[PDB]
Structure 1
Amino acid sequence: GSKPNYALKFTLAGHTKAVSSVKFSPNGEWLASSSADKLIKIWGAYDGKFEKTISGHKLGISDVAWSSDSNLLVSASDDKTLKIWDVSSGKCLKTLKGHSNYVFCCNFNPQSNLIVSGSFDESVRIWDVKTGKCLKTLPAHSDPVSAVHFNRDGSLIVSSSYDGLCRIWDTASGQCLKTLIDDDNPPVSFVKFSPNGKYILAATLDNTLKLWDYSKGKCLKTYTGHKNEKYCIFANFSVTGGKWIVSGSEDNLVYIWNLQTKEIVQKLQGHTDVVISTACHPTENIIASAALENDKTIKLWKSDC
């Protein structure tokens, strides 16, 4: 149909503090969740079946991300480290040390030979996956780094910060290519590249999402109607059915917009706290959503469209 009809299929309980992030494995089999409870949990994407707990961080986790081959995870923790995990064994392969404050955000490149991280220490770091060594420290921002993401060929990194900036970095040199958003305020709470790498989706803590043309440095679309003044809420491109933008909201709902028209096409009700994180299944019309401390659950929603 022209609009989605997402309906609740499963509620995934087990975290003992706020959930911080959910991400589907690229092969579609798994959902990974991270939590302030210091744990990663792995769940079946299709039936919500609890698979395993992955443990080792000494403080809460803000983010987790999958390698391209679905075999590895990287997590970002308040313990000032990232950890690379073998999903099959649950073992920590590498501990990435160098940040001087909470690690907030992380991602693999498409090649999955590099990890990018952002920290409360106001830096972006680029790490070698094989050795766990820090290759580059970028003095990226002047306040905590809220998001980091590689583009589809891995040649670019986009970063965002509470300093109000969005910057694009040349991966190879670590040098800045452009400052896409250059305001004192509001905080830029989330950024990522579009699937094709031509656009950047950016959240600001004034209840606004924007789709930017990277090359032209111009705003193409604005999405509003949700509540986002405090938390670094993820946003997604939904591409399996209709072309949507998806985001959590501080009114405890999942918002779904038509990417082209900017109209709200669905609001998913059921969580009892802020929806901090949403993820879109790579092949099926499935959304995962996760909520803060009142709720501490993940919900799986399925649409015909």
Structure 2
Amino acid sequence: TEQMTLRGTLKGHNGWVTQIATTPQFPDMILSASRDKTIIMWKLTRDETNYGIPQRALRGHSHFVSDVVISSDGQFALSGSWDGTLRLWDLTTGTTTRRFVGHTKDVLSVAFSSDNRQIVSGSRDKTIKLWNTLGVCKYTVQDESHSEWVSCVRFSPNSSNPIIVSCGWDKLVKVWNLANCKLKTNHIGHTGYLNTVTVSPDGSLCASGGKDGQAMLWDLNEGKHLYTLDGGDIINALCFSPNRYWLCAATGPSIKIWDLEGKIIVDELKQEVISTSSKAEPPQCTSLAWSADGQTLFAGYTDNLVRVWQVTI
């Protein structure tokens, strides 16, 4: 039966792992961000003595790098940072193409479109904003926006239509359609602020979570509240699987991998159980991302490590 083994663990950070992402073009790369103010590009050897080595280290920020995302070609990479700026990397030696100037506060969330021509940003400005790849502002959203910090935005894969998700700490999830830039809907739910949201690879769903730590499911186009599940104390990051209908929820002491059909927990990932006391005996898990193979998944922790796992039958 499909179950999990502890694969290995990476090392090479002085700051807490904030995000991880992986391009399906090169699954032999993997990319990471951290509060050591650098994004590290790795070189994955599949030896079990290690599991990878840092290849290069991209440098140049004056505050944390919150979120990071790959290009659809894997030849570019983009970052959002708490210095209020973004950078557009050339992941071959270094040498930033462009830095995006204009925010008054942190840039928390960021994402990179499928056509590689639209780039969004969530900010503690309380503004979602759109960005040309030339590094200028196609649009700015300041009407019908969140009344609190913007937690996470997403580009939605679709048949062709433009839809983007937005969720803030005002305990609401707003869906936006481009070329009118209007509220498609407002979804109400979750007591306490929202941390994260993520969209299905098919794109008709929004799995949302927050302080509540409950996983509520919404319909993108039907606009209906499907159901709610108790996901534990707090869920900081979510990521669907590419080759299954699972959903992997990142809670503090454990990662909870959920089968969706039927609705049940498959397993709970436990890491090293080393004796420590008392407020967070293991480090909290904060980010996670699947590989495109779907065999292996990765995790971000606050001990500066990325723990690897692998599915075993």
Normalising to structure 1: TM-score of the pair?
0.90
Residue 17 of structure 2 is matched in structure 1 by: 19
Residue 164 of structure 1: how far off its partner (Å): 0.7
Residue 137 of structure 2 is matched in structure 1 by: 134
Could you tell me which amino acid in structure 2 is paired with residue 145 of structure 1?
V
Aligned equivalents of 1:36, 1:210: Cα separation in 2: 30
Identical residues among aligned pairs (%): 28
Aligned equivalents of 2:66, 2:214: Cα separation in 1: 22
Q: How does 1:101-250 map to 2 (within 5 A)?
A: 101-129=105-133, 131-139=134-142, 140-153=145-158, 155-179=162-186, 181-182=187-188, 185-228=191-234, 233-240=236-243, 242-250=244-252
Residue 53 of structure 1: how far off its partner (Å): 0.9
- The answer for unaligned runs of 5 or more in structure 1 is none
Residue 264 of structure 1 is matched in structure 2 by: 265
Aligned equivalents of 1:246, 1:5: Cα separation in 2: 13
**Equivalent residues of 1:20, 1:276 under 8 A apart:** yes
Residue 287 of structure 1 is matched in structure 2 by: 297
Q: How does 1:63-74 map to 2 (within 5 A)?
A: 63-74=67-78
- Compared CA separation, residues 146 and 45, structure 1 to 2 (3 A): farther
Aligned-residue Cα RMSD (Å) equals: 1.8
Query: Per the alignment, in what secondary structure is the counterpart of residue 222 of structure 2?
Result: coil
Aligned equivalents of 1:299, 1:172: Cα separation in 2: 42
Aligned equivalents of 1:123, 1:285: Cα separation in 2: 37
- Compared CA separation, residues 275 and 79, structure 1 to 2 (3 A): same
Could you tell me which amino acid in structure 1 is paired with residue 13 of structure 2?
H
- Compared CA separation, residues 301 and 44, structure 1 to 2 (3 A): farther
Residue 114 of structure 1: how far off its partner (Å): 1.2
Deviations 1:194-215 (A, max 9, x none): 1111111111311211221112
Could you tell me which amino acid in structure 2 is paired with residue 238 of structure 1?
S
**Equivalent residues of 2:215, 2:231 under 8 A apart:** no
Aligned equivalents of 1:39, 1:30: Cα separation in 2: 17
Normalising to structure 2: TM-score of the pair?
0.88
Residue 46 of structure 1: how far off its partner (Å): 6.3
Aligned equivalents of 1:97, 1:26: Cα separation in 2: 30
- Compared CA separation, residues 103 and 262, structure 1 to 2 (3 A): same
Query: Per the alignment, in what secondary structure is the counterpart of residue 112 of structure 1?
Result: coil
Aligned equivalents of 1:177, 1:243: Cα separation in 2: 26
Residue 86 of structure 1: how far off its partner (Å): 1.1
Query: Per the alignment, in what secondary structure is the counterpart of residue 121 of structure 2?
Result: strand
Residue 303 of structure 1 is matched in structure 2 by: 311
Residue 94 of structure 2 is matched in structure 1 by: 90
Deviations 1:20-72 (A, max 9, x none): 11111122222111111111011245634222211112111110011111111
Please say which of residues 115-124 and 5-14 is displaced more in the overlay. Answer: 5-14
**Equivalent residues of 1:105, 1:148 under 8 A apart:** yes
- Compared CA separation, residues 216 and 246, structure 1 to 2 (3 A): same
**Equivalent residues of 1:159, 1:167 under 8 A apart:** yes
Residue 278 of structure 1 is matched in structure 2 by: 288
**Equivalent residues of 2:190, 2:214 under 8 A apart:** no
Instruction: Count residues with an aligned counterpart.
Output: 294
